[PDB]
Design a protein around this ligand. Structure first.
Ligand SMILES: [Cl-]
Ligand SMILES: [Cl-]
Ligand SMILES: [Cl-]
Ligand SMILES: [Cl-]
Ligand code: NA
Ligand code: NA
Ligand code: NA
Ligand code: NA
Lengths: 461, 461
């Protein structure tokens, strides 16, 4: 029933402004950490993302509190989730470490103040130049993803006369051969470790795995960790060593739909099937069957920042399209609202069928009582938001007007670096709400100069 | 049969180097317009795209030759397809016009030397600043996509005392109301045109439509053009005017799979179901039932550049993954080849299930006789190429080695502006082969400075 769907969506809306730790209402507008988002979107050109340092901190608290039963836990934010420097700075100041996924990610983590001993460098393609940069900067871990790459680590560590600290990525078969490009097979772990021990400037620290992203059950983490723990225990015996650590990766999910009573996480993984506590319980229980003193490294990405941003986008056009029958009578009307952000700004809404709550931030206390379709500004028929409240339809106040600010919630993970300049619309500015509730610009909107500065061409003037 | 699939793929490979107007072989390597692509990829860092000015010119020839039966045809390259300045310059020097999809696209077309009278500006969200820039620059056409936008065109043209030349976009119901965000309903065309005629600084030039992209049959173009032609004829009568033009949009498909005897274009639109001649026959036949003298405007994007680039990417790692049964016996092996381009470089291979021919450019004369899986360098389990020769599997020479150059063909449409800095891997350089067969860099690879120059942060040194 649409009425029931509409009723439920407006219960969720009221819970946003009366129940959510992030949000309030003022002057009829959605507020984030006490910042009126309508007013903010009159101060900065839309579309833009606004991050909350307070919410990042709360998310980091949930993660670390979840691991209270294991004191030697080291937490590395997976920076492919978001690497805007001011976001990395908030995460650094909140007291955790960083995982990096390219040479330039390593460099920006170092620049913003993560020490080498606070950085893990992972990857399936770590070219000699990448490895040389990482080894020269004394990173806490460089993962070993393949035997081919390991030969470069040996050669380059010898060349620099600097120890490379490594963890061997093993991807358990919980078809992994066909569908998992990353890591070594379990069967290869022993000889790989044996070979690293013999290398003069490579130091074996432990094994690594990463299950995946937005994982809706605890069992995959428990099963995969058990495989890694059993192999770690066995190799300690066979090789006569004591591992420094085990790195169990990331994948803690974030709620993108909150009404769990109406959702099946295994069918719709926008429902978060598990909590950080569930992830920690599964991991710690398995590790403690082997050692309670070993360091556990975790690599959460999405959970750190996902809930901690909103995309603000201005309703910039409207139209009504009407389907008529062959006698000219109306079959239905469609109310299109156009916002100034499309899939070049919010990639996952299109490419990964990702749901984000959508509300009229300018009319946040008004009933969202009109079915509408929400379109982006790209000259591209597929640039509209398909992941609606009911099918492809969204709910906004019937009073919605051009000039209102629409907010997409839970827009803090995998939303910035994935933007494009398709249609030569610019990638967005980014604003940060700091711990004091003050705002500042932390990324500019791309300028026209940015569209062409990369190009090499004969000028005309 | 895999053997048969392998046989057919190697027949296609031989046709590339012995039959294709674009390619040859030399020193065992794939050549493009006589340029050895292995050698080129030792001169420039991979991954990068290489465009062919000769092939752009050939594609433009096919389009214009297709319209020989209609002398007053004006051709506007849809620049959302590719707007690297050197690519736009080649298209300008080849003698056609430009369609633009944002304020900055308009600006870059003007900068590279398209005159205002050679530019069409389309869009669903043309804000006042966008319209003011377009009207001030005397564009040949600004489309009218909605009644809301039309009010801004009236007001701003009055403010500047400059005539805005417009075409009214009408999207026929050939559900269009639910699935087509663009244009007005046919039922709205009459009053919209009547209102424009009464505006002092808005000049109505005709109607506009655009069917879509990679369209595999001629019927949609014929049917939609007929609707637009019938309404144009009727409005000339009702309103007592003579239209300058009709703008029928783009959508000419490009072959991404060439063995048409084995493909159904309506099921797999990588097979191009129609040619430019088929598009022109359908459009011209319908227009000439109304007027033979009127100007026909077309907006091809993909067809201009799609076949005119190759992505060159270096095999940068390899591994074998083996699935074992519960007794330790081998069930299967998977041979993974890792290249230095993933979906942040070649977006559509992931997000739009787009097929591109893949060959070992370094071993182009060798039998491609080994099934492999082809992975990108992103730390992301989904970053491998799923659109294989058979399922998710590709064919490369069993002799393929790290350091070989892999080529993706037909990589010239919608491949540059759609790149991202996900994982802070840079967006690629772009090279151009000019009409003389010489090469030059036309876009640099993003530098590390580019990763962070947009960010605003307190430095440490
Ligand atoms: Cl930590
Ligand atoms: Cl309307
Ligand atoms: Cl022309
Ligand atoms: Cl291997
Ligand atoms: Na705005
Ligand atoms: Na060693
Ligand atoms: Na290279
Ligand atoms: Na007029």
């Amino acid at each position: 029933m649409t009425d029931s769907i509409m009723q439920n969506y407006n219960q969720l809306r009221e819970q946003v402004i009366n129940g959510d730790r992030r949000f309030q209402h003022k002057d009829g507008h959605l507020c984030f950490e006490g910042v009126d988002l309508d007013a903010l979107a009159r101060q900065y050109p839309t579309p833009f993302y606004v991050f909350s340092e307070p919410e990042i901190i709360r998310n980091i608290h949930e993660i670390q509190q979840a691991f209270a039963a294991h004191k030697n836990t080291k937490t590395f934010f997976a920076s492919k989730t978001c690497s805007v420097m001011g976001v990395l700075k908030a995460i650094r100041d909140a007291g955790i470490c960083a995982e990096a996924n390219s040479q330039y990610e390593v460099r920006k983590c170092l620049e913003i103040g993560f020490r080498g001993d606070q950085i893990v460098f992972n990857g399936v393609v770590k070219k000699p130049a990448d490895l040389e940069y990482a080894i020269a900067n004394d990173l806490y871990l460089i993962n070993v993803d393949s035997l081919y790459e390991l030969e470069h680590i040996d050669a380059i560590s010898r060349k620099l006369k600097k120890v490379a600290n490594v963890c061997v990525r093993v991807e358990p078969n919980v078809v992994t051969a066909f569908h998992a490009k990353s890591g070594l097979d379990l069967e290869q772990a022993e000889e790989t470790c044996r070979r690293i021990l013999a290398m003069p400037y490579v130091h074996l620290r432990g094994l690594h795995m990463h299950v995946g992203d937005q994982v809706p059950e605890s069992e995959p983490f428990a099963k995969a960790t058990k495989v890694l723990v059993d192999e770690s225990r066995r190799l300690e015996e066979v090789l006569g060593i004591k591992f420094d650590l085990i790195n169990v990766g990331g994948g803690i999910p974030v709620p993108y739909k909150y009404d769990d009573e109406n959702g099946d996480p295994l069918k719709d993984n926008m429902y978060a099937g598990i909590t950080a506590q569930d992830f920690a319980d599964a991991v710690i229980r398995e590790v403690h069957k082997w050692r309670t003193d070993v360091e556990i490294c975790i690599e959460p990405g999405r959970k750190v920042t996902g809930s901690a941003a909103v995309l603000l986008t201005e309703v910039s056009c409207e139209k009504r399209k009407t389907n008529y029958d062959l006698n000219g009578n109306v079959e239905c009307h469609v109310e299109w609202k156009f916002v100034d952000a499309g899939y070049s700004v919010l990639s996952d809404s299109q490419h990964f069928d990702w749901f984000f709550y959508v509300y009229n931030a300018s009319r946040m206390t008004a009933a969202h009582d009109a079915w509408i379709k929400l379109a982006g500004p790209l000259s591209d028929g597929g640039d509209y938001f398909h992941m609606g409240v009911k099918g492809e339809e969204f709910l906004l106040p019937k009073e919605t007007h051009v000039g209102d600010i629409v907010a997409f919630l839970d827009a803090g993970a995998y939303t910035i670096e994935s933007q494009t300049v398709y249609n030569n619309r610019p990638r967005t500015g980014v604003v940060m709400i700091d711990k004091n509730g003050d705002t500042r610009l932390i990324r500019r909107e791309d300028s026209y100069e940015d569209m062409v500065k990369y190009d090499i061409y004969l000028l005309a003037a």
